[PDB]
Design an enzyme around this catalytic site. Sequence first.
Site, PDB file in Angstrom:
ATOM      1  N   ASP A 168       0.611  -1.211   0.634  1.00  0.00           N
ATOM      2  CA  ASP A 168       0.571   0.004   0.135  1.00  0.00           C
ATOM      3  C   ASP A 168       1.023   1.146  -0.094  1.00  0.00           C
ATOM      4  O   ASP A 168       2.035   1.783   0.377  1.00  0.00           O
ATOM      5  CB  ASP A 168      -1.016   0.400   1.262  1.00  0.00           C
ATOM      6  N   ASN A 169      -0.183   2.425  -0.209  1.00  0.00           N
ATOM      7  CA  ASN A 169       0.823   3.496   0.043  1.00  0.00           C
ATOM      8  C   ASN A 169       2.408   4.262  -1.246  1.00  0.00           C
ATOM      9  O   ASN A 169       2.832   4.618  -0.589  1.00  0.00           O
ATOM     10  CB  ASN A 169       1.010   3.563   1.369  1.00  0.00           C
TER      11      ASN A 169
HETATM   12  N1  77G Z   1       8.106   8.263  12.209  1.00  0.00           N
HETATM   13  C1  77G Z   1       7.425   6.998  12.488  1.00  0.00           C
HETATM   14  N2  77G Z   1       8.302   6.161  13.278  1.00  0.00           N
HETATM   15  C2  77G Z   1       7.999   4.924  14.457  1.00  0.00           C
HETATM   16  N3  77G Z   1       6.486   4.636  13.190  1.00  0.00           N
HETATM   17  C3  77G Z   1       5.290   5.091  13.322  1.00  0.00           C
HETATM   18  C4  77G Z   1       6.064   6.500  12.379  1.00  0.00           C
HETATM   19  N4  77G Z   1       5.379   6.708  11.542  1.00  0.00           N
HETATM   20  C5  77G Z   1       4.093   6.281  11.148  1.00  0.00           C
HETATM   21  N5  77G Z   1       4.568   5.387  12.593  1.00  0.00           N
HETATM   22  C6  77G Z   1       3.366   4.170  12.256  1.00  0.00           C
HETATM   23  C7  77G Z   1       3.366   3.814  11.292  1.00  0.00           C
HETATM   24  C8  77G Z   1       2.157   2.771  10.966  1.00  0.00           C
HETATM   25  C9  77G Z   1       0.614   3.169  10.498  1.00  0.00           C
HETATM   26  C10 77G Z   1       1.558   3.001   8.500  1.00  0.00           C
HETATM   27  N6  77G Z   1       0.592   3.741   7.816  1.00  0.00           N
HETATM   28  C11 77G Z   1       0.824   4.735   7.185  1.00  0.00           C
HETATM   29  O1  77G Z   1       1.480   5.491   8.226  1.00  0.00           O
HETATM   30  C12 77G Z   1      -0.339   5.200   6.704  1.00  0.00           C
HETATM   31  C13 77G Z   1      -0.125   6.819   6.235  1.00  0.00           C
HETATM   32  C14 77G Z   1      -1.735   6.952   5.495  1.00  0.00           C
HETATM   33  C15 77G Z   1      -1.201   8.847   4.871  1.00  0.00           C
HETATM   34  C16 77G Z   1      -1.433   9.465   4.064  1.00  0.00           C
HETATM   35  C17 77G Z   1      -1.279  10.394   3.583  1.00  0.00           C
HETATM   36  C18 77G Z   1      -1.187  10.842   4.635  1.00  0.00           C
HETATM   37  F1  77G Z   1      -1.801  12.854   4.409  1.00  0.00           F
HETATM   38  C19 77G Z   1      -1.135  10.334   5.775  1.00  0.00           C
HETATM   39  C20 77G Z   1      -1.447   9.570   6.117  1.00  0.00           C
HETATM   40  C21 77G Z   1      -2.153   6.288   4.554  1.00  0.00           C
HETATM   41  C22 77G Z   1      -1.611   4.655   4.650  1.00  0.00           C
HETATM   42  O2  77G Z   1      -2.794   3.929   4.266  1.00  0.00           O
HETATM   43  C23 77G Z   1      -1.064   4.516   5.569  1.00  0.00           C
HETATM   44  O3  77G Z   1      -1.192   3.151   5.424  1.00  0.00           O
HETATM   45 MG    MG Z   2      -1.728   1.691   4.191  1.00  0.00          MG
END
Ligand code: 77G
Ligand code: MG
Length: 214
Positions: A168-169
């Site tokens: 994804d993404n």
């Molecule tokens: N710097 C770190 N260190 C550790 N963990 C960390 C981190 N930074 C995050 N995470 C924890 C990740 C857990 C979630 C992973 N998924 C995602 O982060 C995710 C994000 C978006 C998204 C799209 C546009 C936007 F404007 C904002 C967000 C969409 C999705 O479909 C996703 O799957």
């Molecule tokens: Mg995602």
Amino acid sequence: GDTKEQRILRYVQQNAKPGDPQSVLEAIDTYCTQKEWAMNVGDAKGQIMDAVIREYSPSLVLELGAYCGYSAVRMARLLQPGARLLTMEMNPDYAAITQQMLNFAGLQDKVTILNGASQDLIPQLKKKYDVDTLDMVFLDHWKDRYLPDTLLLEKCGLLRKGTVLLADNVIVPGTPDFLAYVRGSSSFECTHYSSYLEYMKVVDGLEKAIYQGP
Ligand SMILES: Nc1ncnc2c1ncn2CCCCCNC(=O)c1cc(-c2ccc(F)cc2)cc(O)c1O
Ligand SMILES: [Mg+2]
Ligand SMILES: [Cl-]
Ligand SMILES: [Cl-]
Ligand SMILES: [Cl-]
């Protein structure tokens, strides 16, 4: 007070039918379109997921990053009897939401949550979880982890010829190192599926990368 994830679960419990995964997906997507955006894969990319799952009929799927369980419900509802999904979720509050979501959907016998970080759990899959090799992997965790965890899966002997990675993404937030790596490697055969960020008029996409062996 409550979190967004708790609100999504309550909404599902109050607006879907127990044991009906499709109703669960619809309730999540309605909530996230009408009330609060959340990072579920969503219906646009979910439809592409469904097409891939149907093509490959995997017997053992690994998911990296569960969140609220949307993608786990999406995949598990289309698995054949006896097929299984393992989903790794490092955030314990999200893990609890995902378990409850799966329970509501009636999919709990098909899905196992592994609470912990992917890099710690991947090396345990063979000995602790009796995994041989994976049929499919869905990557949806921290975007910086896609590449290192792909390389770890290979090191640990978890990939076989034909294992499907679905990421994804790959556009938003983006996974530039992963994408460059798989697209440049003779060990992967890659396809890009252009779509839209969940619940938004913003381009995103899925990458499918089929492992070819060393
Ligand atoms: N710097 C770190 N260190 C550790 N963990 C960390 C981190 N930074 C995050 N995470 C924890 C990740 C857990 C979630 C992973 N998924 C995602 O982060 C995710 C994000 C978006 C998204 C799209 C546009 C936007 F404007 C904002 C967000 C969409 C999705 O479909 C996703 O799957
Ligand atoms: Mg995602
Ligand atoms: Cl999701
Ligand atoms: Cl995770
Ligand atoms: Cl959507």
